[PDB]
Amino acid sequence: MAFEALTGINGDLITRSWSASKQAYLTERYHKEEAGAVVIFAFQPSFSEKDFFDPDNKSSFGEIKLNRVQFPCMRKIGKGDVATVNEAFLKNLEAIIDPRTSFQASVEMAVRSRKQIVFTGHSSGGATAILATVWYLEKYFIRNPNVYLEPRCVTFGAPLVGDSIFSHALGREKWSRFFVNFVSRFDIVPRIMLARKASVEETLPHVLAQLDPRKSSVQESEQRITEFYTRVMRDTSTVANQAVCELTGSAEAFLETLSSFLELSPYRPAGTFVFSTEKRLVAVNNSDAILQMLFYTSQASDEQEWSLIPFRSIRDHHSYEELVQSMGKKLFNHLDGENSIESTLNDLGVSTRGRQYVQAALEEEKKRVENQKKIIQVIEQERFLKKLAWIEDEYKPKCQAHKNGYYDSFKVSNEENDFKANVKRAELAGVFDEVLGLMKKCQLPDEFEGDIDWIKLATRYRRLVEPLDIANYHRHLKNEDTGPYMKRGRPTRYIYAQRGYEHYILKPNGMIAEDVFWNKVTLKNSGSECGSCFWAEVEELKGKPYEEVEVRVKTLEGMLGEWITDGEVDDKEIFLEGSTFRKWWITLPKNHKSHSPLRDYMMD
Amino acid sequence: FAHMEESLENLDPKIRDCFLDMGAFPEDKKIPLDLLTSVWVERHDIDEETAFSFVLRLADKNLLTIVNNPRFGDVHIGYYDVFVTQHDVLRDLALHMSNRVDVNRRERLLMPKTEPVLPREWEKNKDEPFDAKIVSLHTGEMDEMNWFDMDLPKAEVLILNFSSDNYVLPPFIGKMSRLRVLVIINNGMSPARLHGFSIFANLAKLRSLWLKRVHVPELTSCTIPLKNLHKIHLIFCKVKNSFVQTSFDISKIFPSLSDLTIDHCDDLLELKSIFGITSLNSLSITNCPRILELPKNLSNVQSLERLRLYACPELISLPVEVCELPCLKYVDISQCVSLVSLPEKFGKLGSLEKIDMRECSLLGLPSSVAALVSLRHVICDEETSSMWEMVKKVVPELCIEVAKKCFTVDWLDD
Amino acid sequence: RFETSELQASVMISTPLFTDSWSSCNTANCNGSIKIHDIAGITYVAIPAVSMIQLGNLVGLPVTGDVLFPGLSSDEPLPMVDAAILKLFLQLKIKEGLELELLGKKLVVITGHSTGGALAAFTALWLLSQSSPPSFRVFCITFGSPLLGNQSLSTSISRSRLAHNFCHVVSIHDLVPRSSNEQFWPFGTYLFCSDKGGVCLDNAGSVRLMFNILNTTATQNTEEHQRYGHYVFTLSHMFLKSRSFLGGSIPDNSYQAGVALAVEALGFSNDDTSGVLVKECIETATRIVRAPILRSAELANELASVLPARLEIQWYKDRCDASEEQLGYYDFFKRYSLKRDFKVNMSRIRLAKFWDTVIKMVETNELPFDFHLGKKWIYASQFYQLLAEPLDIANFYKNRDIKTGGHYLEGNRPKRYEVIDKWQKGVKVPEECVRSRYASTTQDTCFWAKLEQAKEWLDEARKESSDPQRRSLLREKIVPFESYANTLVTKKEVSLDVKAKNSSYSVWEANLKEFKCKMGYEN
Numbered sequence A: 001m002a003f004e005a006l007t008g009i010n011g012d013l014i015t016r017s018w019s020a021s022k023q024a025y026l027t028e029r030y031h032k033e034e035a036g037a038v039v040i041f042a043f044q045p046s047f048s049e050k051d052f053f054d055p056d057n058k059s060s061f062g063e064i065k066l067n068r069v070q071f072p073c074m075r076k077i078g079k080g081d082v083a084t085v086n087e088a089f090l091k092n093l094e095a096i097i098d099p100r101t102s103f104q105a106s107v108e109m110a111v112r113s114r115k116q117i118v119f120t121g122h123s124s125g126g127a128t129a130i131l132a133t134v135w136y137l138e139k140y141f142i143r144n145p146n147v148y149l150e151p152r153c154v155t156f157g158a159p160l161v162g163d164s165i166f167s168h169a170l171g172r173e174k175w176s177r178f179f180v181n182f183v184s185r186f187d188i189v190p191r192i193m194l195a196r197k198a199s200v201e202e203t204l205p206h207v208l209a210q211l212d213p214r215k216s217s218v219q220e221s222e223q224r225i226t227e228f229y230t231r232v233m234r235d236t237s238t239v240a241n242q243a244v245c246e247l248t249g250s251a252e253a254f255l256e257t258l259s260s261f262l263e264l265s266p267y268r269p270a271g272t273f274v275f276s277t278e279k280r281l282v283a284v285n286n287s288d289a290i291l292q293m294l295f296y297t298s299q300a301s302d303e304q305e306w307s308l309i310p311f312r313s314i315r316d317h318h319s320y321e322e323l324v325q326s327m328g329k330k331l332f333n334h335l336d337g338e339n340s341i342e343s344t345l346n347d348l349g350v351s352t353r354g355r356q357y358v359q360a361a362l363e364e365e366k367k368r369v370e371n372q373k374k375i376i377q378v379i380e381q382e383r384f385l386k387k388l389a390w391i392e393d394e395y396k397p398k399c400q401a402h403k404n405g406y407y408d409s410f411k412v413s414n415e416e417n418d419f420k421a422n423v424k425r426a427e428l429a430g431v432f433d434e435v436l437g438l439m440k441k442c443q444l445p446d447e448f449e450g451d452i453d454w455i456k457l458a459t460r461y462r463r464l465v466e467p468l469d470i471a472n473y474h475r476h477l478k479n480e481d482t483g484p485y486m487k488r489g490r491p492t493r494y495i496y497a498q499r500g501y502e503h504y505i506l507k508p509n510g511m512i513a514e515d516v517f518w519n520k521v522t523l524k525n526s527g528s529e530c531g532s533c534f535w536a537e538v539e540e541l542k543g544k545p546y547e548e549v550e551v552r553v554k555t556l557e558g559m560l561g562e563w564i565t566d567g568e569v570d571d572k573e574i575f576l577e578g579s580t581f582r583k584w585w586i587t588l589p590k591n592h593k594s595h596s597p598l599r600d601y602m603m604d
Numbered sequence B: 001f002a003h004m005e006e007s008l009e010n011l012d013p014k015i016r017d018c019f020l021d022m023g024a025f026p027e028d029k030k031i032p033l034d035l036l037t038s039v040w041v042e043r044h045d046i047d048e049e050t051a052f053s054f055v056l057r058l059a060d061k062n063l064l065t066i067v068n069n070p071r072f073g074d075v076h077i078g079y080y081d082v083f084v085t086q087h088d089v090l091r092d093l094a095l096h097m098s099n100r101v102d103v104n105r106r107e108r109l110l111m112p113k114t115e116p117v118l119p120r121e122w123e124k125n126k127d128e129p130f131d132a133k134i135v136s137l138h139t140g141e142m143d144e145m146n147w148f149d150m151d152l153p154k155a156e157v158l159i160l161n162f163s164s165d166n167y168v169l170p171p172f173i174g175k176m177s178r179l180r181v182l183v184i185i186n187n188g189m190s191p192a193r194l195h196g197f198s199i200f201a202n203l204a205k206l207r208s209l210w211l212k213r214v215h216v217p218e219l220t221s222c223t224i225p226l227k228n229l230h231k232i233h234l235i236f237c238k239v240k241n242s243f244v245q246t247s248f249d250i251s252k253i254f255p256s257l258s259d260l261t262i263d264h265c266d267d268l269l270e271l272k273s274i275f276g277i278t279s280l281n282s283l284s285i286t287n288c289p290r291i292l293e294l295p296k297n298l299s300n301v302q303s304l305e306r307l308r309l310y311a312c313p314e315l316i317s318l319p320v321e322v323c324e325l326p327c328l329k330y331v332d333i334s335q336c337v338s339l340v341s342l343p344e345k346f347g348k349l350g351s352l353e354k355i356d357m358r359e360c361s362l363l364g365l366p367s368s369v370a371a372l373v374s375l376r377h378v379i380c381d382e383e384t385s386s387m388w389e390m391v392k393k394v395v396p397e398l399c400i401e402v403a404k405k406c407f408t409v410d411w412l413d414d
Numbered sequence C: 001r002f003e004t005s006e007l008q009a010s011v012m013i014s015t016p017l018f019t020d021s022w023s024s025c026n027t028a029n030c031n032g033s034i035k036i037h038d039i040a041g042i043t044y045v046a047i048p049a050v051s052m053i054q055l056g057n058l059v060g061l062p063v064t065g066d067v068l069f070p071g072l073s074s075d076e077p078l079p080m081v082d083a084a085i086l087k088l089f090l091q092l093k094i095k096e097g098l099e100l101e102l103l104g105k106k107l108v109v110i111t112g113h114s115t116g117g118a119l120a121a122f123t124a125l126w127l128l129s130q131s132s133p134p135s136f137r138v139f140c141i142t143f144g145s146p147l148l149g150n151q152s153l154s155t156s157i158s159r160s161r162l163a164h165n166f167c168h169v170v171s172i173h174d175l176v177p178r179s180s181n182e183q184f185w186p187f188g189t190y191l192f193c194s195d196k197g198g199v200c201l202d203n204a205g206s207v208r209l210m211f212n213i214l215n216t217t218a219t220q221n222t223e224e225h226q227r228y229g230h231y232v233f234t235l236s237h238m239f240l241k242s243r244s245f246l247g248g249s250i251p252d253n254s255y256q257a258g259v260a261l262a263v264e265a266l267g268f269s270n271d272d273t274s275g276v277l278v279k280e281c282i283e284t285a286t287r288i289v290r291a292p293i294l295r296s297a298e299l300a301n302e303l304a305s306v307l308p309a310r311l312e313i314q315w316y317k318d319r320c321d322a323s324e325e326q327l328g329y330y331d332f333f334k335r336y337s338l339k340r341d342f343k344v345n346m347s348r349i350r351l352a353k354f355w356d357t358v359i360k361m362v363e364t365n366e367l368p369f370d371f372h373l374g375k376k377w378i379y380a381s382q383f384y385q386l387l388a389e390p391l392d393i394a395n396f397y398k399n400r401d402i403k404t405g406g407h408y409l410e411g412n413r414p415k416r417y418e419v420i421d422k423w424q425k426g427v428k429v430p431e432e433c434v435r436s437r438y439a440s441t442t443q444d445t446c447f448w449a450k451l452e453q454a455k456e457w458l459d460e461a462r463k464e465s466s467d468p469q470r471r472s473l474l475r476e477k478i479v480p481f482e483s484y485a486n487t488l489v490t491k492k493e494v495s496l497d498v499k500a501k502n503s504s505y506s507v508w509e510a511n512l513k514e515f516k517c518k519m520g521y522e523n
């Protein structure tokens, strides 16, 4: 029952998915099956060299970057890097979603009928199903999350699709629980994509033809299978060793030196992988642990084990029927939940070094959780909130009552309030820089960026401290040594907080912040994107003739209303009599002085 | 003018004399409380307790306008930010009532302000054995010897306000029946040189010395041993080679010395001579850089009670012989940035009662301080609160106060 | 923690570079010539193994000639290299052929066997230790090369951060790399391999201890070429082989289990004293310390805590340059007259202590390698230096003896400032925008020391004998400083303090003008 408790899929659903996948062999493109209130889509597997490695691809691995418009959530929120997926699988998916196939209409009709959607497939086609699930997660679930709209992805021996960025994006959105992948102990198909194309290009067509269940009459060449297995195992061993060395943070200088001389596959497991053996069922939820188990399970033990492993690996690709039929006669164990994993790994054939590596990978997650707990405890301290309360409720009201904006006061003054504000700003900047470094070094859970409280705290800190940082930057005349503040002076933490806030507020809609900005709109590294950076723009625009730059002024005037409405800037302090912005606007010639749209906000 | 006169009519004659004294004392400057108490002690013979009681009684009115006064922490603490300022109208008042007698002026000899001239009322009467219980002379570029003869057969207190760089000393002390207080104040921006210091050795009855910002003359055996001097306070002075030399025994020259203060003085890398005095009772060093370690000869002193070490950076470590002091009641270390660890046997000080280590980057408190039964008050930072409460668990009477760091810009003004 | 020496060895073995280098070395030995060829986009250069050559003589690195080592240190302990290796490298003219055949290459791997391996290591050292880093990356993989070098050379290589590009594979049975004078010091990562696996050691002391214990071991062999061939052949297939790894009784501890597995991989049982000593050496190879990745993040808190000292220094500078006397903050600190000077001295001492602690932590290797490449740390170090170096110069000159003219740029500059300058050397090219006004702080932190030296030279010229030739020579040595100061002033790269009416620079300029007018030299 624990399998149903964890994965959320019953044995009957697994049997129906396997039956649909088997039936999809005869059918073309996709096959739709309606069982009760469940709609299952099975994608037809394809067995050809071009279906795994794209002929047009020039890289050593058939990987291409995703499109931001198509998959806005499949990227890193902070770094901004997009994920990479297989080119052939992406092309097959794009052909599937073509309007001529009527797949979109069927999906819409099934969604409107309030029926659960299950995506299933076998071999490479099954991998395509995973992409389809992501498509669903980018079309309906993200628009309005609901229990009835929760999808289900089931794959049987599907090869790896996404890289580490793909897995991180799946984990951050809490979508990894909807993917279940059944992989045999000796299955070789999931390990195919972990090898370079040049090593196995000669032997790929023969192995792919042999693996085809439709036409198994082809003559078996043991030498070719042995060479293919040897190359795949060597590449998998190299990839796993490098990954486990990098994860533990050891030999970093040696790894950095050797990275340039090595070309390794970037594909990483994504989803809940469950390993099937003769009488046990083990499910793993950690990508590094899944990769280590995938490498270590397919190993020999003695001479009798050899000379038969490649044949068993070839045969096991069509042995999922026995596992599906005999699902209820095998024990189910969770590797992460269990405390003692020695017996399970010994039963599955993992060696001692594999056990140690799996244990280290599991302990890495616990260390990350402990770091997140420590960060939360530090954040929830009384003094951290006291500093922000003092900044918001004492310095700003006093400056406003002093007829001078607090930005201008921080720019030039000689009072103890400025010194205290600078000290508090330095302390807050140090704390946030420590948090940003911890996040950058991949030592925090993927869900940390998804926390609403953290996003709100970061947004408040930015909106309260960024003008002070700009004033400090422009007070010491640092803009004449490096350049504009937004070019090479803006701290990374503010950019990360702004990107997180924009993603949080734009995820229900679907557009990237750039689209919204450009749609609303020389503007290279401009200040019209961030409300808190408006002061910096005033620094750049002032001291220049009106004729040279005019469009930036108009853009600033247009965005000022939105910034005021959203609370990015306060009209009481930035429109003060002694503010530098008022003086700059006074110096502006009479034409724009009379054509400005905020007259009611300035003229008394 | 009338209101404070009426108040003076209501004051006791002793407190009236004290009010006149402080009021006629030089204005527009910060006057330490210790000097004022010493002046009252040697003038009215009221002793320190009654002097402090009088100060507290007079603190109610505006004639003794108080300052921050952080001395409320304990009574064993010294003087720091405790200066008292008075109004110039009160100064003129105290100068008014019977204080311009031509020849006699039985008390309160004053000078309204620094000038290269002397008061014509007393200048004309050169031959005047005037009773001079209180003398305060303010002189700028003019010579200290003056142009007449102050015999002063009954003088008790002498205060001088000085200036310029090259200067001499008057021969008045040579023709002096008795004297107890001698204060020299220099307001220049550069060290001031003094000439003719042998005349000051004529009288040994002096009990307090308040030199400041000057070239401390080197001690010599020809100097008469001051058997009554008790206080030597040097602030912003120039030790140069006066205290560096060790040929002459300072204990023989100053056997009654009990309190020595060195503040804001550089070029003081040698302290063996200071520790060589066996009569030392309260030693305080404040803001003295260029000091590596204290000399390992403090075991000679067996009566030292206070070891205030305010500021004094670049101090590598505390001496191991400090624990041998039998009556070290008070230890004060503040603003130290080079101290990393206390002595291992620091807890053997059975006479220790209060210790201050504010803004001190201490690494680890030794377990020996767990035996500090007599320790009562600890003023430290929040970092050491845990290992001070660990001591407080053993001794319930221990009280720990966390000193908050206040950010002020008042230091920039000075 | 976690034992990873065996993991590092397995990572190194699993790469195709091992087999490619072995094949290249075998081909070079068979052909008896330097073989340069491209395999899988990587240019392998294999140096043939030479013999009938004696080793042991130490002469040192060349000082004058075609070959040079600018990156190598030149302190009191002079780095030394084997005379035979240098002579063979000079005779074979490897440099010319290598630079001719490596034009346009991106990845270069130099390899050799025994003396060939030593020659390959020397060639890689010559390539890396140049005026500028080579356009291509190098990786010297040696197969049982004899020990060469010295303690000074190894220390300089470790300081230069160049040991990561050298790897040596030494069998547990050969005697050629283990038979050398005690003056020789190993350098770079060393791989100890055997029929059941390998281990990697990246510590000179650990490698020396392993060599010593292997020397004390009774088991030794004379034929090592066939042993190396068998070892590489059986290690290239370790991926397709899973062993029991029984290790006797498996300890219930991650570190203990890892150490036991590493010991077992070398063919040493846990019963003989040799196995126990090997286990002790492996345990002592890795030290216990807080994770550098967490320490780098944690450093921001103490940086923020020390920042108020810099804020106080900034406020003091503003007050000094806003004063009526207009003496400049440098001269104000040079003349101890107010308590604010003492407070600023305390803040400067605290900042110097914090930065010295940071530098010591960096040099201890308690932080990641790219710690100094961080933009934030570089900018913070620059901001601290530009504000604290004049204060340190003023303090040194105030405490400087009258007749001890050691100055600040003649061996008295603290090493922390040199490390800060080395970090700033990686800053991108600054923009050439014209400054509208004077900068807040002087760009050159050594301006005050040069000004003091120029003032001393001018005073010496003014107060001396007639000696017209001496005056001409002193003026010739002085006028470069005047030209540099004029260029700095015209570029507006100096703060207002140097432009004060009563500043030291103005007094020096007035004195120079008066001297020129009095005596009449041109220009």
Ligand SMILES: Nc1ncnc2c1ncn2[C@@H]1O[C@H](COP(=O)(O)OP(=O)(O)O)[C@@H](O)[C@H]1O[C@@H]1O[C@H](COP(=O)(O)O)[C@@H](O)[C@H]1O
Residues within 6 Å of the ligand: A426, A468, A469, A470, A472, A473, A478, A481, A482, A488, A489, A490, A491, A492, A493, C374, C375, C376, C379, C380, C383
């Ligand atoms: N010209 C400069 N001089 C000195 N520091 C600079 C300069 N420019 C940027 N910085 C600082 O360099 C760090 C980059 O970290 P970053 O996370 O981006 O690292 P990377 O991800 O890129 O590797 C940010 O903290 C920038 O902080 C700005 O500088 C002002 C003074 O800072 P202060 O508080 O110390 O006085 C602050 O007001 C912020 O405007």
